Amino acid sequence: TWRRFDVAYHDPDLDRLILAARPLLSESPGRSWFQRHWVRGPHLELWFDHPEPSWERVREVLGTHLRAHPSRTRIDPDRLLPQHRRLALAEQIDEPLLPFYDDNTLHRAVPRSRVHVLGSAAAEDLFHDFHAAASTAAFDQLDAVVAGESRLGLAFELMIAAAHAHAEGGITGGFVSFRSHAEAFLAGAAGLRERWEAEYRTRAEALRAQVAAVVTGTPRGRAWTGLLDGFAGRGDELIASGALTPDTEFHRALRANRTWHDEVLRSPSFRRYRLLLNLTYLQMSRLGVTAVQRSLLCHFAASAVEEEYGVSAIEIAVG
Numbered sequence: 001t002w003r004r005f006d007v008a009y010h011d012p013d014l015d016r017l018i019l020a021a022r023p024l025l026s027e028s029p030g031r032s033w034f035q036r037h038w039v040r041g042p043h044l045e046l047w048f049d050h051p052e053p054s055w056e057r058v059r060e061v062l063g064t065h066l067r068a069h070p071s072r073t074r075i076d077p078d079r080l081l082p083q084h085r086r087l088a089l090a091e092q093i094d095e096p097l098l099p100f101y102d103d104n105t106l107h108r109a110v111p112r113s114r115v116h117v118l119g120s121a122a123a124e125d126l127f128h129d130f131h132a133a134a135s136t137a138a139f140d141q142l143d144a145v146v147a148g149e150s151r152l153g154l155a156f157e158l159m160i161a162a163a164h165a166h167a168e169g170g171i172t173g174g175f176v177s178f179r180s181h182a183e184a185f186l187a188g189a190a191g192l193r194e195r196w197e198a199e200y201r202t203r204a205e206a207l208r209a210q211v212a213a214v215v216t217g218t219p220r221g222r223a224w225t226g227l228l229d230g231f232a233g234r235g236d237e238l239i240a241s242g243a244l245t246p247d248t249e250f251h252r253a254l255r256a257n258r259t260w261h262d263e264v265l266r267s268p269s270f271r272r273y274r275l276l277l278n279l280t281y282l283q284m285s286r287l288g289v290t291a292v293q294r295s296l297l298c299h300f301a302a303s304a305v306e307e308e309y310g311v312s313a314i315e316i317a318v319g
């Protein structure tokens, strides 16, 4: 059902290349979407379930761009291969990892299946529907970033909006997830945590204001939560049928808290929230936000909500 094209582009800043692809994902019927990926080296993937654009049309648009604005980053294959072998085990990727693509090249590629990770073809199809809708939204987000808006700031707004609209209890409920994710990432890194805290202090006033603005309602926040709304029903149904599948002070506390077990973890509302937050994190990846940066945002979001509302995620976890 799907066609895939890989654009090998070794500079981590894909944003202009993505914007050049906008007509290909905007001009013909069918679902189309893009993501960033690492197999055979850094590359952009374009996915289509209908027969247009053709390979020839894809080359007409993106060949022109690669010749005008080529990547000048050089990969280090010797260091990348072992990293990719580990990623492949972790992400359950069975595709060949070699040879690495040459920089600034276009390829047809074989679409991969994620059923074994997501739980069913129906769950995979729902993620494809999300990607199709979200990729359209991403072009406007990336136009803003290229134009000079803060990438992390746009992502922060998506996260706050998702927690306020889609968590039970709104922002002062959903923010506990942000702490959880930051503390799981940090895995005992006191020195990194202190660096994050010190940067957060410089940002606090602006970040608290952004939290209050998003909670009041912003056009971007409402647009993102509107998009997420489209997946809530089907998501609840796949979660309920089974079709959609840390040693830290915080997580130790949580594991001893019976409300976590009985009213949070197993609740359909938390499962739904967590699905829609995970879709938000996928969007952040599409927008070029790395795993460390997503985890920093989680730290900043939790800290901002705590300061604005005078609440404490660790106190909630302890119970």
Ligand SMILES: NCc1nc(-c2nc(-c3nc(-c4nc(C(=O)O)cs4)ccc3-c3nc(C(=O)O)cs3)cs2)cs1
Pocket: 168, 169, 172, 173, 174, 175, 176, 177, 178, 180, 181, 254, 257, 259, 260, 264, 274, 316, 317, 318, 319
């Ligand atoms: N002493 C009794 C109590 N314990 C709790 C707890 N709530 C949580 C909680 N945890 C996560 C978490 N998310 C993660 C994650 O990894 O995503 C871990 S904990 C997300 C959200 C909540 C809350 N929901 C609400 C709501 O009003 O509905 C408020 S706080 C953990 S213990 C509430 S009252």
